[PDB]
């Protein structure tokens, strides 16, 4: 169940669901595994908020263990296309693709809550079939791995060689270490 | 099924579901296992109530056997961020993560119903793979265990050494013992 809230306006009272209420204030939630359907919904929200106001920041709240890459790159490419600065915040955790969408936010507007945790690794995949087809799909996921490391280096500021060494295996980063690593910019410990 | 209630206002009658009605009075329910989706819903409610009024207390009613930690820390970090004091009440039970969110409430505004019961233990986890990966995930959950014990000590007032000894195995606390342990502040036996 999803609670319903009421917004007071000049015309009259208005009934909203809680997630649609926050969308009115330019807040998007990225929850759970990243798949084609949920990601296609986040794209629709970003495009809508750009049209409603292209000069006001969009906020993307991330609590996800990651998922499909191609579904996540649809979110990434949209964030870079649109004019508004997509601020990203990590709540709970932001793993493999969730961490890539976290660091892909606008520079200076990427945050981590004080006890959140970030995880980064290299792409996972697989194939079954002839050796000629295994070579094709093996070359492809390596190109994806190279592309994801270049973009990680671009946004984090690190070198491509450093990103390659750290993402060969799972690497957990606390919220302070994510700041030092360039993955996020600061921490929202308390409200001021 | 969820019953519908009616609220009488000056403009006219208004139909609400029972959970959305209580949200209008700044009451949130944390029921069942703690997962990413239910926790992302509780965060949305807390943020909404802060915006509607940042000086009025929020109430979080807890009846949960716990669940995922990363989902629970998204609730914890939100409670500490927002300006309103999040009062917590334990109904029925508040186990591993539910107990951590119970004690994380505002000091002086944490309660237990007279027959409720609290349980605390150390994190549960697991991994399957190479020994190099087992070392990584084993070190991580130990850091989580250390972080959860520090925060338990901060809010309960106990020492870190006492929290470590008591959480090595499951430890049940009645509502009076939770008060003596610093986990909650008082008991709501009757209404006065």
């Amino acid at each position: 169940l999803v609670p319903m809230v009421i917004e007071q306006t000049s015309r009259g009272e208005r009934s909203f669901d809680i997630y649609s209420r926050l969308l009115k204030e330019r807040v998007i939630f990225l929850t759970g595994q990243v798949e084609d359907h949920m990601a296609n919904l986040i794209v629709a929200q970003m495009l809508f908020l750009e049209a409603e106001n292209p000069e006001k920041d969009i906020y993307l709240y991330i609590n996800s263990p990651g998922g499909v890459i191609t579904a996540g790159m649809s979110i990434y490419d949209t964030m870079q296309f649109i004019k508004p600065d997509v601020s990203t915040i990590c709540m709970g955790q932001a793993a493999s693709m969730g961490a890539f969408l976290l660091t892909a936010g606008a520079k200076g507007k990427r945050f981590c809550l004080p006890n959140s945790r970030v995880m980064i690794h290299q792409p996972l995949g697989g194939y079954q079939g002839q050796a000629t087809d295994i070579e094709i799909h093996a070359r492809e996921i390596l190109k994806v791995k190279g592309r994801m490391n270049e973009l990680m280096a671009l946004h984090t500021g690190q070198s491509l060689e450093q990103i390659e060494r750290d993402t060969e295996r799972d690497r957990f980063l606390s919220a302070p270490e994510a700041v030092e690593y360039g993955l996020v910019d600061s921490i929202l410990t308390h409200r001021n | 099924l969820v019953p519908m209630v009616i609220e009488q206002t000056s403009r006219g009658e208004r139909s609400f579901d029972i959970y959305s009605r209580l949200l209008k009075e700044r009451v949130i329910f944390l029921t069942g296992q703690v997962e990413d989706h239910m926790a992302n819903l509780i965060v949305a409610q807390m943020l909404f109530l802060e915006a509607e009024n940042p000086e009025k207390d929020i109430y979080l009613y807890i009846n949960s056997p716990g669940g995922v930690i990363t989902a629970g820390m998204s609730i914890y970090d939100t409670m500490q961020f927002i300006k309103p004091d999040v009062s917590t009440i334990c109904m029925g039970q508040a186990a591993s993560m539910g107990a951590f969110l119970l004690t994380a409430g505002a000091k002086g505004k944490r309660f237990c119903l007279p027959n409720s019961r609290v349980m605390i233990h150390q994190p549960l986890g697991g991994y399957q793979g190479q020994a190099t990966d087992i070392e990584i995930h084993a070190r991580e959950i130990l850091k989580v265990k250390g972080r959860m014990n520090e925060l338990m000590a901060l809010h309960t007032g106990q020492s870190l050494e006492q929290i470590e000894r008591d959480t090595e195995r499951d430890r049940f606390l009645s509502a009076p013992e939770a008060v003596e342990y610093g986990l909650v502040d008082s008991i709501l036996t009757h209404r006065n």
Binding site: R21, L22, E25, R26, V27, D57, Y59, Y61, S87, I89, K109, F111, L188 | L47, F48, E50, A51, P54, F81, K83
Partner: peptide, 9 residues
């Protein structure tokens, strides 16, 4: 606004 970044009175 309502979010973390948005300011509230």
């Amino acid at each position: 606004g309502i979010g973390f970044g948005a300011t509230v009175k």
